[PDB]
Each structure stands twice: as structure tokens, then as C-alpha cells.
Subunit: 80 residues, 4 copies
């Protein structure tokens, strides 16, 4: 009904648009260079560091793989 359930702070702007895994993990990039994987309760599952801002929005493969781009020129494939 438009109340905060929770808010996770990253180190920079979040322009990336979140994706949701089969188990409800939320994946989103940040200008702080990381891809984040966050649990449905608001805690960090893991974060993967790229060489640049992650403005790209993650996609999730059939086998759980997370793809997303970065400012650092690469497209990343990361295991869930």
C-alpha cells in the first residue's frame, strides 16, 4: 500500500533496473561498480565488482547465470 518494506544502500546511484531470480533474489547494478544480489529480506547475498559503473540491467539465464554489462566495456556472466 506504498510503505517501505526495506532499503539497501549501495555506494552510488542505482540507474540499473532490478531483475528477480527464481528464488526471489534481486539483482541490480550500481554506479559504485558492483553487481548486487540481495535477499528478499533486505540483506546482501553477494556483490561482484566490475571495473566500472553498472548502468546495464541484469538478465537471468535458464541455468541461473546473471548477465549484465558495465562501463568497463565488458559483458559479464556470473554464477548465481
Amino acid at each position: 500500500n506504498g510503505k517501505l518494506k526495506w532499503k539497501f544502500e549501495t555506494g552510488g546511484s542505482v540507474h540499473s533496473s532490478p531483475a528477480i531470480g527464481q528464488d526471489g533474489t534481486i539483482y541490480v547494478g550500481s554506479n559504485d561498480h558492483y553487481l548486487y544480489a540481495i535477499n528478499p529480506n533486505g540483506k546482501l547475498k553477494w556483490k561482484f565488482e566490475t571495473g566500472g559503473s553498472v548502468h546495464s540491467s541484469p538478465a537471468i539465464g535458464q541455468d541461473g547465470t546473471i548477465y549484465v554489462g558495465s562501463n568497463d566495456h565488458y559483458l559479464y556472466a556470473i554464477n548465481p
Copy 2:
């Protein structure tokens, strides 16, 4: 046939891409700092204020939760 059904004014640019819930509510961010929830008929359901421009496009969880990023560095989870 490409005719205006309605247009809902926010206080700034809308770069965010809208999402549509199971009940047809539309979720979209604006550079005015708000995430908006709008009824299919053009009237505001609720708006949630963030600390910055919402350029992220919202995603919707299986239980109705709306996730979006903000320029204020946070990832938000909001109840429907």
C-alpha cells in the same frame, strides 16, 4: 489507433520504464524523486518519495513487492 487515453503529470522527466502489476496498476519512476503507482484509469494510487531521481525501471515480485533503484544510492522494496 494511437490516441491519447490519458496522461499523468509527474514533477519531472520520466526516463524510467513503466511496469504493470497483476491487477493492472502501473509503476513508474520520475526525475522528481517519486515512484508512482497509478490506476489503469489515470488516477494516482500512491506515490513513494525517494531522495533522488528514479531513473531505474521498477520490477514486481511474485507477492506484489515493487523494487526500484534511486539516484539517492538505494535499492527500494515497497509494498503494493
Copy 3:
């Protein structure tokens, strides 16, 4: 095999990300201010002019309504 099927010229950059109707129409916004609806064969079905750049990516409601944001501060609902 990675060959051009066709290409449609708009009047400016296309930063928007295309959406696809049930009937195969492609929707996409452009810096030239317009949302385009384009037939699967490469020709214009209709175009709707907004007050500003359409960086927002269209979404399609269950009744065929196309929702998109504009730089002109509005979220638009357009009949298919």
C-alpha cells in the same frame, strides 16, 4: 544469421527499448519526441508526438494499452 531484416529511420537517437504487441507490432520511443508503432514488415503503423524525448521504454497492458514516459514529465496511456 545476423543480417538486417529492415531498419526504420526516426528523427533522432533511439535510446528507448522496443516492446512487442500480441499481434507483433513493435513500439519504441525516440529523441525526436515520438512514440512509434511499427508493423513487423518495417512500415509505420502510427506515431504519437509527445512534448519531449522518449527515453522511457514502452510497456503493454493486458488490453493492448501502451504506456510510456516522456522527458515532458508525463506518463502516457495510448490506445493500440
Copy 4:
């Protein structure tokens, strides 16, 4: 677990958000002007050159067509 499966280098920033085909190809644009099609093992299937940065995120038709916008003002439809 958050471990790199693989990373593909393009010639510039990847702001485009990856799309995944029915056959698991990953498609994504780059500031280097190309749309890339990459196999689930990390190797290039093919790349199509546009006149400008591809910040748009690709969408995929029911018939496998890949649609994406470009800074060069066009919407492109490309065969898989």
C-alpha cells in the same frame, strides 16, 4: 555463488541491458556501435554494426527477430 563464469570485452561501455533468446544466445548493444550475439559459453556468435552507440536494450520477437534502437536514429530488425 557470485563467481565469474566469463566476461566478453566489447570496444566500449555496455549500457544496453542484455536480452536472452529462446536458444540461450545473449544479445546486447555497446557504445562501440555494435549489437553483439554471444553464445552461452562466452564466444561470439556474430556482431552487427550500426552507425552509433547502441544504448537501447534488444527485444526478441516470437519468430526470433532481434529489434534494437541506435544512436544513429534507426530502429533495427535483425535476423537471428
